């Protein structure tokens, strides 16, 4: 309440000041309070506070509830990773122009899922995990004073919960591998149509994984620092790195970001930064 009083009374700087529209956004210089302000700006500039009548104090308490339920002692899967996944979601809807291809409920659920998709993570060394993350997302969404979705009707609320649940479930890389071949086959044949609800639901799953791994697309000095955090989680429980990074980019990332650019050409900076990082890690791999 000492933190919530200061956050609620603050002024929320514009999206341009906060630099949350650039795919190259980084958070290393930001306080926990600054990340909260950037998050309010995301809800605000996506018209989520307005279209769904969110009381300011409730959104402030909800953001702080979400942030508190991430574990700081976890090197990578912490609040900062969830904040970044939401930022890339914002950058994709705005700079990537994905906004027009989605509905308000879908955008409202994507932002909530991106912020929640790793709640109570304990580090890689501890599809059940994603079901636990949605469980914690649901518990916070139902906490007194945190119900940011109270402005929705019951039909709106039930649809949004279904989308939130699927989006968090989609961040299971096993589900991504199960489903990506379909998404690539329909991108191949020039058949991809978002009007198909099964195709729209599949795309929302791919958009989640794209933002979930957005770190692999960051500029080299940032990507180097994030790859450190990843190593500290996998390794030190809190040489071989360059090769494992190129293998991850090859197996997982490059096709995903390639397909995303076909859906919207303005998501190209993700595919670009992911390639420049493959070059950098490949050179390091060769010593
Ligand atoms: C001991 O050190 C490492 C070991 C492996 C990796 C590789 C693979 C790794 C991985 C995973 N998710 C990542 C998400 C983002 C980024 C970035 N940027 C990189 C990610 C990432 N890199 C999950 C799958 N995985 C597995 C199975 O090991 C990196 C480091 Cl440093
Ligand atoms: Mg996860
Ligand atoms: Zn994640």
Question: What would you note in describing this structure?
Answer:
Helix 8 runs antiparallel to helix 9. 67% of the residues lie in helices and 0% in strands. The chain has a single domain (1-287), classed as Catalytic domain of cyclic nucleotide phosphodiesterase 4b2b. The longest helix has 24 residues, at 240-263. The protein has 14 helices and no strands. It has helices at 2-9, 15-18, 32-45, 48-51, 56-68, 79-93, 104-116, 128-141, 154-170, 173-188, 197-212, 220-234, 240-263, 268-285. Belongs to the cyclic nucleotide phosphodiesterase family. It comes from Homo sapiens. Plays a role in signal transduction by regulating the intracellular concentration of cyclic nucleotides. This phosphodiesterase catalyzes the specific hydrolysis of cGMP to 5'-GMP. Specifically regulates nitric-oxide-generated cGMP. Mg(2+) binds at residue 118.
What's the layout of helices and strands?
Layout: H1 2-9, H2 15-18, H3 32-45, H4 48-51, H5 56-68, H6 79-93, H7 104-116, H8 128-141, H9 154-170, H10 173-188, H11 197-212, H12 220-234, H13 240-263, H14 268-285
Helix pairs in contact: 1-5, 3-6, 6-7, 6-11, 7-9, 7-11, 8-9, 9-11, 10-11, 10-13, 11-13, 13-14
Bound molecules: the ligand COc1ccc([C@H]2C[C@H]3c4c(nc5ccc(C#N)cc5c4N2)CCN3C(C)=O)cc1Cl, magnesium ion and zinc ion (ZN).
């Amino acid at each position: 309440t000492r933190e919530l009083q200061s956050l609620a009374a603050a002024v929320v700087p514009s999206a341009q000041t906060l630099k949350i529209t650039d795919f190259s956004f980084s958070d290393f210089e930001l306080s926990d309070l600054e990340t909260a302000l950037c998050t309010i700006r995301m809800f605000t500039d996506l018209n989520l506070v307005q279209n769904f009548q969110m009381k300011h104090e409730v959104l402030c308490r909800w953001i702080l509830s979400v942030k508190k339920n991430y574990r700081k002692n976890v090197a990578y899967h912490n609040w900062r990773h969830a904040f970044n996944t939401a930022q890339c979601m914002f950058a994709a809807l705005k700079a990537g122009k994905i906004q027009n291809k989605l509905t308000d409920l879908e955008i409202l659920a994507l932002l909530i899922a991106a912020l929640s998709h790793d709640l109570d993570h304990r580090g890689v060394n501890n599809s059940i995990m994603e079901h636990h993350h949605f469980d914690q997302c649901l518990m916070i969404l139902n906490s007194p004073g945190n119900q940011i979705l109270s402005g929705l009707s019951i039909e709106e609320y039930k649809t949004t919960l279904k989308i939130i649940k699927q989006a968090i479930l989609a961040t299971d890389l096993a589900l991504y591998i199960k489903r990506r071949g379909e998404f690539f086959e329909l991108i191949r044949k020039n058949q991809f149509n978002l009007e198909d609800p099964h195709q729209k639901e599949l795309f929302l799953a791919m958009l989640m994984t794209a933002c979930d791994l957005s770190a692999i697309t960051k500029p080299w000095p940032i990507q180097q620092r994030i790859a450190e955090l990843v190593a500290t989680e996998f390794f030190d429980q809190g040489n071989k790195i360059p090769s494992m990074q190129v293998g991850f980019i090859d197996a997982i990332c490059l096709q995903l970001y390639e397909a995303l650019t076909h859906v919207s050409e303005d998501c190209f900076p993700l595919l670009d930064g992911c390639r420049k990082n493959r070059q950098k890690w490949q050179a390091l791999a060769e010593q």
